[PDB]
Protein backbone atom coordinates (compact mmCIF):
# COMPACT_ATOMS: atom_id res chain seq x y z
CA UNK A 1 0.00 0.00 0.00
CA UNK A 2 1.09 3.54 -0.43
CA UNK A 3 0.73 6.25 2.19
CA UNK A 4 0.59 9.92 0.70
CA UNK A 5 1.02 12.89 3.11
CA UNK A 6 -0.44 15.90 1.02
CA UNK A 7 -0.84 17.60 3.97
CA UNK A 8 2.15 20.77 3.80
CA UNK A 9 3.48 20.73 6.75
CA UNK A 10 0.50 20.94 9.60
CA UNK A 11 1.87 17.91 11.11
CA UNK A 12 4.44 20.29 12.70
CA UNK A 13 2.64 23.15 14.15
CA UNK A 14 1.54 22.29 17.30
CA UNK A 15 -1.64 22.46 19.07
CA UNK A 16 -3.57 23.47 15.73
CA UNK A 17 -6.85 23.63 17.06
CA UNK A 18 -5.95 26.42 19.39
CA UNK A 19 -3.65 27.92 17.56
CA UNK A 20 -6.35 28.24 14.35
CA UNK A 21 -8.70 29.79 16.78
CA UNK A 22 -6.26 32.46 17.88
CA UNK A 23 -5.99 33.36 14.17
CA UNK A 24 -9.61 33.64 13.66
CA UNK A 25 -10.36 35.43 17.14
CA UNK A 26 -8.03 38.35 15.76
CA UNK A 27 -9.77 38.53 12.35
CA UNK A 28 -13.10 39.19 14.24
CA UNK A 29 -11.76 40.99 17.08
CA UNK A 30 -9.78 43.58 14.47
CA UNK A 31 -12.55 43.52 12.32
CA UNK A 32 -15.57 43.82 15.33
CA UNK A 33 -13.64 46.71 16.96
CA UNK A 34 -12.73 48.91 13.77
CA UNK A 35 -16.28 48.39 12.51
CA UNK A 36 -17.99 50.19 16.04
CA UNK A 37 -15.00 52.46 16.19
CA UNK A 38 -16.03 53.69 12.66
CA UNK A 39 -19.65 54.18 13.17
CA UNK A 40 -19.43 56.06 16.59
CA UNK A 41 -16.65 58.25 15.04
CA UNK A 42 -19.72 58.88 12.17
CA UNK A 43 -22.16 59.46 14.70
CA UNK A 44 -19.99 62.00 16.90
CA UNK A 45 -19.41 63.87 13.57
CA UNK A 46 -22.78 63.65 12.41
CA UNK A 47 -23.82 65.24 15.87
CA UNK A 48 -21.54 68.06 16.06
CA UNK B 1 -30.06 79.05 41.72
CA UNK B 2 -30.19 81.30 45.11
CA UNK B 3 -27.55 79.69 48.09
CA UNK B 4 -28.87 80.52 51.65
CA UNK B 5 -25.52 79.62 54.17
CA UNK B 6 -25.93 79.92 58.00
CA UNK B 7 -22.87 79.91 60.02
CA UNK B 8 -20.63 79.67 57.01
CA UNK B 9 -22.27 76.15 55.76
CA UNK B 10 -24.96 75.73 52.60
CA UNK B 11 -28.97 75.22 53.97
CA UNK B 12 -31.14 75.65 51.29
CA UNK B 13 -30.77 76.10 47.49
CA UNK B 14 -33.32 78.43 45.95
CA UNK B 15 -34.60 77.53 42.14
CA UNK B 16 -36.76 80.29 40.91
CA UNK B 17 -36.62 80.59 36.43
CA UNK B 18 -38.08 83.80 34.90
CA UNK B 19 -39.37 84.66 31.26
CA UNK B 20 -39.28 87.75 29.52
CA UNK B 21 -42.01 88.15 26.76
CA UNK B 22 -40.50 89.26 23.22
CA UNK B 23 -38.67 88.84 20.69
CA UNK B 24 -34.67 88.54 21.23
CA UNK B 25 -31.38 88.01 18.80
CA UNK B 26 -28.83 88.58 21.46
CA UNK B 27 -27.31 85.27 21.40
CA UNK B 28 -23.71 86.82 22.34
CA UNK B 29 -24.98 87.22 26.00
CA UNK B 30 -26.92 83.66 26.09
CA UNK B 31 -25.63 80.26 27.98
CA UNK B 32 -26.81 77.44 29.93
CA UNK B 33 -25.46 75.01 32.35
CA UNK B 34 -27.61 71.98 32.42
CA UNK B 35 -26.67 68.91 35.08
CA UNK B 36 -27.18 66.03 32.65
CA UNK B 37 -29.36 62.38 34.16
CA UNK B 38 -26.49 60.11 35.65
CA UNK B 39 -25.13 57.39 32.99
CA UNK B 40 -24.55 53.67 32.96
CA UNK B 41 -22.53 51.47 31.08
CA UNK B 42 -21.83 47.68 31.82
CA UNK B 43 -18.64 47.17 29.84
CA UNK B 44 -19.11 43.32 28.89
CA UNK B 45 -16.83 43.10 25.82
CA UNK B 46 -13.19 44.36 24.51
CA UNK B 47 -14.78 46.22 21.96
CA UNK B 48 -16.99 48.28 24.41
CA UNK B 49 -13.59 49.14 26.07
CA UNK B 50 -12.43 50.11 22.45
CA UNK B 51 -15.23 52.27 21.44
CA UNK B 52 -14.55 53.93 24.92
CA UNK B 53 -10.76 54.46 23.87
CA UNK B 54 -11.57 55.66 20.72
CA UNK B 55 -13.28 58.89 22.32
CA UNK B 56 -10.99 61.69 23.24
CA UNK B 57 -12.79 62.78 25.98
CA UNK B 58 -12.38 59.59 27.84
CA UNK B 59 -9.51 60.55 30.54
CA UNK B 60 -8.87 58.05 32.81
CA UNK B 61 -6.54 58.92 36.15
CA UNK B 62 -4.91 55.61 34.96
CA UNK B 63 -4.49 54.01 31.77
CA UNK B 64 -3.90 51.00 32.12
CA UNK B 65 -7.22 49.91 34.47
CA UNK B 66 -8.94 47.10 33.53
CA UNK B 67 -12.98 48.21 32.25
CA UNK B 68 -13.63 44.54 31.76
CA UNK B 69 -17.09 43.58 33.54
CA UNK B 70 -17.23 46.76 35.79
CA UNK B 71 -20.00 48.67 35.38
CA UNK B 72 -19.23 52.90 34.88
CA UNK B 73 -21.13 55.99 35.97
CA UNK B 74 -21.16 59.13 33.61
CA UNK B 75 -21.83 62.05 36.43
CA UNK B 76 -22.06 64.93 33.55
CA UNK B 77 -22.32 69.28 33.44
CA UNK B 78 -22.72 70.70 30.12
CA UNK B 79 -22.13 74.37 29.82
CA UNK B 80 -23.09 75.51 26.42
CA UNK B 81 -22.96 79.64 24.68
CA UNK B 82 -24.92 79.95 21.83
CA UNK B 83 -24.38 81.82 18.21
CA UNK B 84 -27.93 81.38 16.84
CA UNK B 85 -31.45 78.80 18.49
CA UNK B 86 -29.82 76.05 16.25
CA UNK B 87 -25.93 76.36 16.81
CA UNK B 88 -23.81 76.59 20.06
CA UNK B 89 -20.44 78.98 19.73
CA UNK B 90 -19.06 76.57 22.73
CA UNK B 91 -19.99 73.12 24.57
CA UNK B 92 -18.24 71.92 27.44
CA UNK B 93 -19.24 68.52 29.01
CA UNK B 94 -17.75 67.70 32.07
CA UNK B 95 -17.75 65.76 35.60
CA UNK B 96 -16.48 62.50 36.94
CA UNK B 97 -16.40 58.75 35.84
CA UNK B 98 -17.06 55.85 38.63
CA UNK B 99 -17.03 52.42 38.88
CA UNK B 100 -19.22 50.38 41.07
CA UNK B 101 -17.19 48.44 43.70
CA UNK B 102 -18.20 44.88 44.59
CA UNK B 103 -20.05 46.95 47.67
CA UNK B 104 -21.92 48.83 45.11
CA UNK B 105 -20.30 52.00 46.56
CA UNK B 106 -19.16 53.84 43.56
CA UNK B 107 -15.07 55.48 43.32
CA UNK B 108 -13.92 57.85 41.15
CA UNK B 109 -11.47 56.45 38.19
CA UNK B 110 -11.73 58.79 35.44
CA UNK B 111 -12.88 62.70 33.76
CA UNK B 112 -15.04 63.30 30.81
CA UNK B 113 -13.53 66.31 29.42
CA UNK B 114 -15.12 67.39 25.71
CA UNK B 115 -14.62 70.93 24.47
CA UNK B 116 -15.18 72.54 21.45
CA UNK B 117 -16.41 75.77 19.24
CA UNK B 118 -19.44 76.02 17.21
CA UNK B 119 -21.10 72.40 17.47
CA UNK B 120 -25.17 71.69 16.29
CA UNK B 121 -24.62 69.09 19.82
CA UNK B 122 -23.45 67.34 22.74
CA UNK B 123 -21.62 64.04 20.81
CA UNK B 124 -20.67 63.01 24.58
CA UNK B 125 -25.42 62.40 25.96
CA UNK B 126 -25.90 60.82 22.54
CA UNK B 127 -23.17 58.27 22.89
CA UNK B 128 -24.20 57.73 26.48
CA UNK B 129 -27.96 57.93 25.59
CA UNK B 130 -27.08 54.60 23.36
CA UNK B 131 -24.91 53.20 24.78
CA UNK B 132 -25.56 53.26 28.33
CA UNK C 1 12.72 -2.24 35.36
CA UNK C 2 15.50 -2.95 33.72
CA UNK C 3 16.59 0.87 31.75
CA UNK C 4 16.64 -0.11 27.79
CA UNK C 5 13.53 -2.60 28.35
CA UNK C 6 10.12 -2.05 28.35
CA UNK C 7 7.64 -3.74 30.57
CA UNK C 8 4.78 -6.26 29.47
CA UNK C 9 2.02 -3.79 31.02
CA UNK C 10 2.76 -0.38 30.51
CA UNK C 11 1.17 3.50 30.20
CA UNK C 12 1.87 5.58 26.97
CA UNK C 13 2.65 9.22 26.45
CA UNK C 14 1.76 10.79 23.90
CA UNK C 15 4.42 13.01 21.86
CA UNK C 16 4.06 16.24 20.28
CA UNK C 17 4.24 14.80 16.70
CA UNK C 18 1.45 13.13 17.87
CA UNK C 19 2.39 9.58 18.04
CA UNK C 20 2.14 7.45 21.75
CA UNK C 21 5.23 6.55 22.94
CA UNK C 22 6.53 4.57 26.18
CA UNK C 23 6.50 6.74 28.90
CA UNK C 24 8.71 5.41 31.68
CA UNK C 25 7.74 7.24 34.65
CA UNK C 26 3.80 6.94 34.10
CA UNK C 27 4.48 3.54 33.51
CA UNK C 28 6.07 3.16 36.90
CA UNK C 29 2.82 4.80 39.06
CA UNK C 30 1.27 2.50 37.26
CA UNK C 31 3.10 -0.93 38.08
CA UNK C 32 3.64 -0.02 41.73
CA UNK C 33 -0.21 0.98 42.24
CA UNK C 34 -0.80 -2.47 40.38
CA UNK C 35 2.11 -4.27 42.94
CA UNK C 36 0.33 -2.68 46.05
CA UNK C 37 -3.40 -3.87 44.36
CA UNK C 38 -1.41 -7.55 44.62
CA UNK C 39 0.13 -7.57 48.47
CA UNK C 40 -2.65 -5.13 50.28
CA UNK C 41 -5.50 -5.06 47.19
CA UNK C 42 -7.72 -2.03 45.71
CA UNK C 43 -10.95 -0.89 47.25
CA UNK C 44 -13.92 0.36 44.91
CA UNK C 45 -16.03 1.92 47.80
CA UNK C 46 -18.18 4.55 46.53
CA UNK C 47 -17.03 3.63 43.07
CA UNK C 48 -20.36 3.57 40.79
CA UNK C 49 -19.99 1.28 37.34
Known amino acids: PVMADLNGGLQFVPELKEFTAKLRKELVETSEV ?12 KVV | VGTLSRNGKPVMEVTSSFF ?63 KNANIFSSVKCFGPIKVELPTKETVEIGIVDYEAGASHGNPVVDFLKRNG | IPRETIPFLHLRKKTPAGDWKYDRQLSSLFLDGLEKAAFNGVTFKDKYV
Do not use: C
Not at chain 2, 22 to 33: A, L
Not at chain 2, 52 to 66: I, N, P, T
Open chain 1, 34 to 45: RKAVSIETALEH
Open chain 2, 20 to 82: YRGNYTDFENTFQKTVEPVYQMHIKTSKDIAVLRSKEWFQLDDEDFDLLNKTLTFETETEVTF
